[PDB]
Symmetry: D2
């Protein structure tokens, strides 16, 4: 499994391409739209290729997401050349030479030899995550139909709220979570987070937060211990840290595990009727690079990403003079993290179970499951 996104924030459209998905997975334009809608939660889809009659074909799946604001940008972001005199009269084509702290602006301009930040922010912008969730929808359809696996998210903290550290939600809690204005699972934590936002809004300030993706129903043995790169945690870490504004990733109890003693840090195993059973999940469902059957828990730390008006000092690269950054989402981050987790899980599953069609993959899964049971 591979995935690619393309598109500028104010270009004509975004494109998501996924290659390597088995034929026979049921996914539709509506499913993609539903997931794009979930991305819009918190306080135009065209399938071009790879799917026929709601079922994947096995070839590359290309998904286009149109930008509604395109008529406003079709000259400033035109693909082809445009008379530079006609363009000099266009206010919105003014160059951006004041990099926002915390953004790709400054490093991107220097890296690519740009003197206008526009090409950098157009591509760096988190609007790109919409293309990711289009791709992620294919992965999650596969995960559900092949493995009975569900993926979801909930917000652990926003701003200075007290982190919810109770049990993670199951799939049936998703409607309640999605109806929450902060996509919180816990009512007390919800109230605390809403309060933090209210105070930040009034102060005209911005907040980041912590988000936890949960994947349920995974078989034992996805990922591997054979090298650093094959470890599922390594894979998960790359996929979620690569999301815009993410500054930290944890598996399970993460950094808090590093503060516990070995006697209380791990998940002990006990005899059960249908295999080994654990009573805690501090590992977050990954041990030694592989899924252990427990719920997968991955946490992502998002920094405040909205630029706070007239608060951040910067430099005008055109002049060398002082300036202030001019401005241009935790629950939605949760949704994007779901997507990223889904993509990697799906890739890991195809790696272990192979197959070119869903039925074949399903056969291999069943047979692996039977063999584990016959142990």
């Amino acid at each position: 499994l591979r995935w690619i996104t393309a598109g500028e924030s104010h270009g004509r459209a975004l494109v998501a391409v996924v290659e390597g998905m088995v034929a026979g997975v049921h996914v539709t334009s509506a499913d993609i739209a539903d997931q794009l809608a979930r991305r819009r939660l918190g306080y135009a889809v065209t399938v071009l290729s790879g799917i026929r009659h709601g079922s994947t074909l096995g070839g590359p799946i290309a998904i286009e997401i149109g930008n509604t604001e395109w008529p406003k940008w079709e000259t400033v972001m035109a693909a082809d050349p445009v008379d530079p005199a006609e363009l000099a009269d266009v206010a919105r084509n003014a160059p951006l030479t004041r990099p926002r702290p915390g953004h790709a602006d400054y490093a991107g301009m220097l890296k690519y030899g740009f003197d206008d930040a526009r090409p950098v922010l157009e591509r760096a912008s988190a609007r790109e995550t919409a293309a990711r969730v289009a791709a992620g929808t294919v992965a999650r359809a596969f995960l559900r139909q092949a493995l009975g696996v569900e993926v979801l998210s909930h917000v652990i903290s926003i701003g200075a709220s007290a982190p919810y550290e109770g049990p993670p939600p199951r799939a049936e809690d998703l409607p309640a979570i999605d109806a929450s204005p902060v996509r919180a699972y816990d009512k007390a934590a919800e109230a605390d987070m809403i309060a933090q936002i209210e105070a930040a809004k009034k102060d005209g300030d911005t907040l980041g937060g912590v988000v936890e993706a949960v994947a349920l129903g995974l078989p034992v043995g996805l990922g591997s211990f054979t090298s650093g790169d094959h470890r599922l945690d390594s894979q998960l870490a790359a996929a979620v840290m690569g999301i815009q504004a993410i500054k930290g990733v944890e598996i399970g109890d993460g950094f808090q595990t590093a503060r516990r003693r070995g006697s209380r840090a791990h998940d002990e195993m006990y005899p059960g009727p249908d295999g080994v059973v654990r009573s805690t999940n501090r590992a977050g469902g990954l041990e030694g690079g592989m899924t252990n059957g427990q719920p997968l828990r991955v946490r992502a730390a998002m920094k405040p990403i909205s630029t706070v008006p007239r608060a951040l000092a910067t430099v005008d690269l055109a002049t060398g003079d002082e300036a202030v950054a001019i401005h241009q989402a935790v629950p939605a981050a949760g949704v994007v993290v779901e997507t990223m987790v889904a993509l990697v899980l799906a890739r890991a599953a195809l790696e272990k179970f192979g197959g070119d069609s869903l039925a074949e993959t399903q056969r291999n899964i069943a047979a692996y499951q039977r063999s584990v049971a016959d142990r």
Copy 2:
């Protein structure tokens, strides 16, 4: 740049291979040995290929690290078949059927259809990190000679100690850090950590901790904002999360950034004589996926990895009965994290500056630096 490790913990030797390194980098067997020694800090090298007269050749560099304990294992871990009757009399060839919680044992056995955990732990074991640091030594020689970049580490916390949150060390502080029994930079933090260890030792328990790699002297613009996978933070996250026992990774102030307001979360920029200058480094030297010139800071959370005697319940997979796990390092984790950081930085540098020889790469670096200055 690519790197591969091979070797079982009790096999004849470990092998590290790095491919894609430019010719003309000065690295020697002694340098590799020095770095392997640093890995042994905390409370036989043969270069087979790719280096000639202390200078890289451009082809694959293969580095062998011999296992001193091999004569004890040369039958149990023999490559070739061995009479199963002769082997049944060998005590140390007894099968391991009681997976340690927190380790690859259980998931690995199920994944590969093993009924003895030996093949799993032999490869999963953190002894493998010795092969990594062999490979890492080539990367850091390159980083130093091509970019004047230095990489180091210090321990932030061990067990329940109070995290050192003062300034990171510079390269000249490395001797003092390496002489510390806990590789601490800060004396007060050092004392606190030693205390935590002393109490854990007496209790017969084990500790994890937090470690911070620091890379200094990086040019602006390594990594990219163009997609998730090209983000340097994504790359860093994969490389360090893939290290044994690591459950969390942060860039800069990490999870704490997610608890701050946007007005206080970022690093403001100011005019300077030789380019833009910042007064804080909350970003940890990465913004929007790229190096900004500030010190690179990456943090890794290590779980306690030593199995605590007769404390952890498990299952005997042979019988289905209850059992207890039988047993088989924070400052050293710091050293391994250095290695991983070095490897990715080196890869990112070769990606941007290209070249087949060090001189060529150095030319390209100089010219990129000149162009940035002429802005």
Copy 3:
């Protein structure tokens, strides 16, 4: 540099994506259209992302090519589900169960568990090569602007014609070649090929042939001898053999080299004013995996790809009974081979010279060239 194509032959559109191209390369929708036109030689483009005002941005370039016949196929090749009763009345949705010999039909159906060949031929079809040449246009713009490199093709033989073995064309011969109905460089060879086609047409039969891509102006040292995969010939071979209907690839004099004696097989070197000079090019501009500065010559053998009416016996997979294959281009193959060659050359150039913008890459090229001259 990476490239991806997506699209079914009768889907709404094709998509080409190229990732890793430096910013600042001048390419336009018109240039892509021109190259798509050349593909149509022999006896609707929308740039969605990655290019602004005729200049590459550095991010992923997505190029859409619309299918004009889409209204006819928008139900049979609909992405979303369609009432199976409404579909059963549609003649053109009849299933294809008689695999054509020489095509992906049979193996594809078995591989993916299809009982209709439609999903296989839709993706396998050489219509996909249109997406390739869209991507190839970006590479060749880069090659021209960064390296002064030109890529072209001419046909060596069609059917049983006598292979033209005279000198390859230069770039100024391209108009004459493109005006030839068989894209021949040599007039005598041209007449012979036209004759072979005329006789085949009259016999109601089909022809394959041999095609030679030529790349001019390459620097010494693209590709490498360090391993099999880094050899440029290896790379070239993969890219052109992967083209539909190609059964053979040669570099330079290819299979004929294997029939010569060592004394007459190679290209001897002689002193020249601006470096070493050769008087023959039997190697086809590659030696030991790298460009030697001579014209690059790559040859591809295309099998007859059009199914000959009622001539080819096959099986009806639905019944197990005998059947005949029902039917569903050498100069155009030449054009596609150009594309493939361009893509790999561009990737190899970016590998050696690095850079994130064209100017930077150009600096590195100049400096490498100066260093070679100062030898």
Copy 4:
């Protein structure tokens, strides 16, 4: 599946590493030695990791091949620095500044900024193919045990001999082939080739030739039609063209197919008791990028690789003056081609059938085979 080779021709040893091979494949140091012996046909192995008691472990397999001539080279090819005064007295450390035509010498020196060709030829040398066949032995053990697939080779032509175009050999013909001084299958062709060699030897000249690898017993559907890179022919082409001295690759009847009419170019299908049956194999067992069940045939054109004494003019790069190249194998090429074919087939099989152990892979294979039969 991935493979890496490392080693210089006169270094201490060669290393082959293969990663991604399933656990439970029976391969031994003896098997590797046997295959290294076959490579030595025509007119010290240590397994360091990844194999235990003659059975693969699932981790990276590292195989060391010692160089017997090492004591002669241990100063000239020393890894570590050596007094340059002590080295200046060593005759065999004299620099090589006269590139051989047809070799990596000239392009390699320029590419890496070397003024001595020694580092180039040490790595470029076909001695490296010994590391490949070590790796190839693991793949072929897997192919045999998982799929009942056998791989072999025979020589089609050497020098100006008349190409043997009769039927390819089966596995039982391998002893007779390996006993032939030119590894010919056909007695008449054998005599012709021996004659060509005799005449070349007497003339003090060198020969290249054509070689054909044959793989038998493949399932339908390895490789794919979904994109250029997934085509098995593309993969095969890269792997064999990347072999030293190979200038051409064909699948099946290759370039001759391009000279036939469509009515006679392909392999017609007929009804059979256990699936579809063909009476010709012009395709060489690949159609539309995938295996069709027929014998896989791949042909490689090897140029004469031995430098003919005082016959080839070149330049002394030290002076700019004329010079002559000073000197430093078709049946063995056949053996190496076998290896390369085996590696890719094995990778393609693991891609389709997945699995982490041989038993699991075998289950998936059986079930795929059953499903095809139940069609």
